[PDB]
Amino acid sequence: MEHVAFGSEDIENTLAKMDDGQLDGLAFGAIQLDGDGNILQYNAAEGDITGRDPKQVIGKNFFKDVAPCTDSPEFYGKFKEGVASGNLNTMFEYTFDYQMTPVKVKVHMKKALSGDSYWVFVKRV
């Protein structure tokens, strides 16, 4: 395990520039998106929660393609606002239900330090 807790205050610094293998060591799901929602990174813990294959989703659009249940004001709307302001930092519960048994999660979206990059962290609740 990487020794990092979900929700930690400086998570963006600890995860800055992490390679794919290190991201796979986290206790929680971690996705990195560009400002349009294209998937740049997707870790093993996320794939175990959602069923998606972390290798196959890279390059797909999270809102248009992988996760249409998040294409709503309550998820995508918050993402795109926080991308626009440059200070996205929001934590909220949500249910994932596309082509899967519904599962309720806690989501933490936070701007990454690297350019045009935004984290989406997920754990079960």
State the residues that interact with ligand HC4 by CB under 6 A. 31, 46, 50, 52, 66-70, 96, 98
Please choose, from the candidates 84, 80, 104, the residue with its C-alpha nearest in 3D space to the C-alpha of residue 92. Answer: 104
Q: Quick one: 11 or 70, whose CB is closer to ligand HC4?
A: 70
* Smallest distance from ligand HC4 to CB 101, Å: 12
Beta carbons within 10 angstroms of residue 33's beta carbon: 23
Q: Quick one: 41 or 70, whose CB is closer to ligand HC4?
A: 70
Beta-carbon-side half-sphere exposure of residue 98 (alpha carbons within 13 Å): 12
- Cα–Cα separations (whole angstroms), residue 70 to 17, 59, 62, 116: 26, 17, 8, 20
* Smallest distance from ligand HC4 to CB 66, Å: 5
* Smallest distance from ligand HC4 to CB 57, Å: 7
Q: Quick one: 18 or 75, whose CB is closer to ligand HC4?
A: 75
